[PDB]
Point group: C7
């Protein structure tokens, strides 16, 4: 258990494909334990989704690749957890 452990991505995307498709593909990466997609807000042609990815030594670029290949773009990385222990934010 090392490297990138959890990422929270601010992603913008068209209506297609559906977020279940995004979720599935991402979840199928080998170093990924689970993926959560939260619909932030849908608009006229786009959709704003918050993706939480849990894993072990996650390959950002890989993750960004799957996302972009499906027409989505990453607007920002909101949270990054790295290491042996999943450290939560102290608000």
């Amino acid at each position: 258990l090392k490297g990138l452990r959890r990422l929270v991505l601010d992603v913008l995307k068209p209506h297609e494909p559906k977020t279940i498709v995004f979720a599935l593909k991402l979840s199928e990466l080998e170093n990924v334990d689970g993926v959560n997609i939260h619909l932030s807000e849908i608009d006229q042609a786009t959709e704003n989704i918050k993706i939480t990815i849990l894993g072990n030594n996650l390959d950002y670029e890989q993750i960004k690749g799957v996302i972009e290949d499906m027409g989505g773009v990453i607007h920002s990385v909101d949270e990054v957890v790295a290491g042996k222990i999943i450290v939560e934010s102290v608000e």
Copy 2:
């Protein structure tokens, strides 16, 4: 083994009849479904807004949507999707 779509939060519109209970039962009788939670969002005239949370393993979206429509329901939005081996909650 646990994989695929694990949880779906669905925004659904439907007529008073049949009652949410039938939906819950029918959805819960699906093969990979562990459980189903149907929360009433708001009642209107001849209409009813519910939030459907379906937990299970490698769930079939299409099979779920099918059940719902087969009962006069319609899916307005997919609010949250969880996929993978571990259930990940939104940060």
Copy 3:
């Protein structure tokens, strides 16, 4: 064996009598009912609005509705339903 209806949150309106502790007792005595929670939402002139939470296994809605209605209450709406092997909570 866990299956069927597992939990219901019923919005019920009823005259003052019988008291809610009687609704609770009667509902709790039903077979397959693990427990019952009756929350008082508001008291009116000659009526009360109460929230009923029923836990159990493979619950029979009609039977539960029967008890509530035999008792003088009316179900205005089913606010929550849970069905299946696992009691899944609502994600907020």
Copy 4:
């Protein structure tokens, strides 16, 4: 066997005497009462408003009512009732 009335929350009005500690002790001394919690809601110039939560097995309402009345208090309302094998919480 665990059954009957399991937990009550009572809206009680009482004179300043006797003290809430006397109500709590006396009620906790009842045959099938596991515990009692008295939360002071408001002290008025000649009376007080308390919320009495009583936990137990097959609780006797009339008996609990009696103890409260012999002590000079009166039950204004029954806010929550729990009954059966398991203690269920409101959702």
Copy 5:
């Protein structure tokens, strides 16, 4: 496990002695398992404190004596828990 188990007191006391001593003396009473003193507000010559006393079969008169013999006064009993099971107030 019988009698008074928890008490929450609204106490008024002059600046001296320090709460550090209240908590310390009270914690030293026979049937007390622990004491939590929370500072509500401090004024020009006094301060309002919240005393949480946990234990088994607590003696109110003893505690009250210890409080007064130190200069503080009990303005009110905010919560009382009696019995075999520590029952929290249902909100």
Copy 6:
């Protein structure tokens, strides 16, 4: 044996130097101190207000106050205190 001052929540005022890191460090090296948490409440032109939480057994206030003093800090108030065999939280 677990007794006396168990936890303290200290409101402290101190010049920017020495840094809170040194404060936490020297306090944590005290005899019966299990751990220390220093929370920066507010920085000012020449001073900063921190909240200090000290966990341990039969803690010595005089000692704690001493160390804080020596580094130029000052205890403005004692917001919370726990004493006794068991750690009791406020209700």
Copy 7:
């Protein structure tokens, strides 16, 4: 031995480049560090404000500060410090 600085929460300012993932990775690769959490507070024109929480044992601040500065980061303030054997949370 479980001692010293256990957890730190640093308010940091930095240019968009390099990404926060590299910071999170590099800080997690430091000896003594069990895990790192970088929360995005805000993105500005040429800058970015992040809150970094570091967990581990007997952490070296000067080392952490260096890694950050070596990457263009700057520590505007140390918001929380935990030191000792047990991780203590702010009350």
